[PDB]
Amino acid sequence: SGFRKMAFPSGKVEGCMVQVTCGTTTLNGLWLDDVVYCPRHVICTSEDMLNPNYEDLLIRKSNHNFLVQAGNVQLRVIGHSMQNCVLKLKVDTANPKTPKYKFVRIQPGQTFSVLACYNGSPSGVYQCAMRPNFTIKGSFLNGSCGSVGFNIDYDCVSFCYMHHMELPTGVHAGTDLEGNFYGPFVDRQTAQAAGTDTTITVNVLAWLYAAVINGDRWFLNRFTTTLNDFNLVAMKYNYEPLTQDHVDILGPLSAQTGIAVLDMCASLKELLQNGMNGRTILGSALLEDEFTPFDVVRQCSGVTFQ
């Protein structure tokens, strides 16, 4: 037992990180097969980051303008092109440690592991959620551009996120691996800001179910409610709606606890209104919304990867 914020093992990704240098700017890149992916803003100067025309700035560049280094091994750049917001640098070496992979785009409400990275060297690993407003509350310092987010399905790495920038509130925005941003953000210095966020209701319910499985039952209660009356309360506490599909998805967690899904919503209704009253749940004083039902079924039962 126990419950903790848990990432996938990062070794399969660690074998794909490189550093890309163009001009005076050094960032991270992702090396799969014979291609290195990285944010396209690596070609930009400081005064280019204002109003850039990236088509214009890229035709002014060469194969040799780009330096790639995989640890203590230098890669020859043999081609370059822009796909949406990323640069895609053909190198003369197919990564000998290329895993099975996919490029998927995730939904807000889903989670992923991040491998934060500096000068092509992995520094740390941690779990994240895609916020309803398409930001992520990460930990990234200067030089972490190009660090990726990923999920692992037995032996297959689903890359889902590439880091691009930090917004005013200290949160981060990026793209999927085909270079299309998550949310209404752009790679040119403007006054862009995050936008209003919500709490991910379905995840909170999944985490309450994790706490019952681990022995915190003080917030359980006899009562029930309707899907409709519970949405009246989540609306007023800036929690997103719950659907019959969210209910059907919680089914397996309901049948292991014997707590009908609507019964747990009545619990959540009271937590929202009465607070937690000096107690905690899974060592937290907060209703935690960054675990999905799948995450719970992962830790509170058992699935490994290869």
Added chain:
Amino acid sequence: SGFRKMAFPSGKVEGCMVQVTCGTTTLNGLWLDDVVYCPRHVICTSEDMLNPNYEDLLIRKSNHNFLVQAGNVQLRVIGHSMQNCVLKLKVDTANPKTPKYKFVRIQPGQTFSVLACYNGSPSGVYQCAMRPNFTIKGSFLNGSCGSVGFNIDYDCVSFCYMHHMELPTGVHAGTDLEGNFYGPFVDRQTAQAAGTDTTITVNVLAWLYAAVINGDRWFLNRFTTTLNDFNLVAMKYNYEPLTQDHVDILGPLSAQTGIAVLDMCASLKELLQNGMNGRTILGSALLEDEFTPFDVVRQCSGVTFQ
């Protein structure tokens, strides 16, 4: 910026996990050079786990009684012996992916990454602290025995922890890699229990300094106190004493914030007495004690590994 619970990248350790089978019991092992380390209770039956004489139960075993499997590759066991509470199985193959490593023993108050593991397959990675009572609040299900904890110093893996069991309160006990338990626990089923714990004061102060660096200043204040008067209050809130060495260690974090160490203790004094008053600190409603000063200087400045 940002601040999150962050582990070291796990790839160097992932290359060392195997599964060990003896009788009907399957657990994880650590393969460095030509030796596999694992909890010695793998040789025990169900009714052996009551009052075992491990010297007696091991001489009754053979080299072939032990099956080792590194993924889809089987290892020949050519020798076996007990070192304190672990088994140390000589195999005919030196792990081709043995990293630089050390076997160190950590102090309570220090942190480490765990790679949780099932049938020799890594499942997840997460950061932990050694509690003052020598337990760890982990996430481990049945079959995770032999999973290790570790720190990474540039290219060197300091292995510090091997998991052995789960205690009644859902916390976990284990050994260092020389087989000596952390704390007063034993590998034979008794009524053993965790013992009273404390909050790690020096770490809380380091985390408050992380929140100033990231922009949470609402708990700062003008006042100061003495090292002695602050210990009167930590004594009454079950927080361990603070020493002049803890003060000297916080020095660098004091000079980056301009908040004298004793000034931050007055902050902590008021948080303990007045509560947090419906606010949060680094997305937490709780005073967080599982980051050391080094962890803060790691994320809030920058250090990577290779």
